[PDB]
Amino acid sequence: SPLSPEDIMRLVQQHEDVAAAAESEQLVAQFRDDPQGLYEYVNRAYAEGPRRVTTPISLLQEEITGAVTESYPAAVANDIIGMGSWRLKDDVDPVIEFLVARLEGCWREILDTDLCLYPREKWKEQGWDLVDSMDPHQELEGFSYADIPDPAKGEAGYPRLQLENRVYCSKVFRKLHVEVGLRQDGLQVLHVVVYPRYSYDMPIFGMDIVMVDGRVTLAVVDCCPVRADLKLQPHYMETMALLQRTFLEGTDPALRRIPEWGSKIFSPLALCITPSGPEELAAFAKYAVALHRAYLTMSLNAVPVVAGPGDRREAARLQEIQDGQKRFCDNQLVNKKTRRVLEVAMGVEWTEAYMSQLMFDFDPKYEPPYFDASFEKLYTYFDENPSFGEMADEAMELERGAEAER
């Protein structure tokens, strides 16, 4: 009947395990019922129509002259914008256009209260926001994509290489990075990666598309685990499984080979594909968009792990997080494909610096700041449920009491 000096610890373990399980289940409860809503949100938002704005100023306006003010949800707005103001559009294959538009739309729509731009001295003053091989010193001030015509075969320059990057910081993510590259021989790459801050226990999100002459030759998407055992939390595995059952069903199960280099960083549910026709590509695209959106929405409610004086478990957790992110960075650096397509065009002393400082940098002693602008939500609120000051109350009781005589 009495208890033992050990089974107390058994009780502690069981309690914290049931707590973790409960919260992980609560996280998936939202996607579980209807997974299709992770890709079909734009179509539904379009279906519901343009909302009418009811704020005192707009009501007074549309009553005075005629002018009705209309609004649109965030999904429709980021669908109207599209590949908004990228300077290298008009050169991008429509598939890469679609994917970039969707990914940046989810960033701007979900993280909008804390999304900042990465510090400008780290990438944007070195001239890394738009890179051209025919002008490696920026003596045309970044208009080389328009001033210099494409070199013909055999001339000094063939083939030309162009890159464009965008880097953001946020509250949970220390870096959200999207980069597009074009080469004259008919090659186009797209590379997206999302790193959580050094104090959050989340996997790293990653996507790569490589298409040649309009045909997608390689496509890989995965949530690379960050722990030492290559094991995600329960809810990440559950969501990936549910989404693969939803979108990828009826497609190739044997084409999902695992690259030799990913075998040390990939999760057991990574997706690598050389698509066959249009249906495979459509399935993969829907799946990638849905997976990204689910990942961001589950990040919306993350809490850091803090190291308390005396606690060793949290120190161990922090060290494991740091080492997992570093392992990902150093094992991505030897993906020799992009490395060589860079270095055979821009040199090597440039390539090493660029790949070290921007693509896969890892310095735990520096993570960029952010700017929390949540107070904005107050202002918007109080412009549609306003309050009028103590003298409109008399006028309104007069209006009611005199109108109610009918």
Partner: protein
Amino acid sequence: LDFVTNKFITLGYIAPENANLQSELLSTKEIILTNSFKRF
């Protein structure tokens, strides 16, 4: 530009055909512009 445009669309704007019969900014839009200039 992309960010401020997304916000302005989701706030509200006078459609060209709805209006039959913006020289200055409202106050919510001024909060939004100041913040966007501070972040980006």
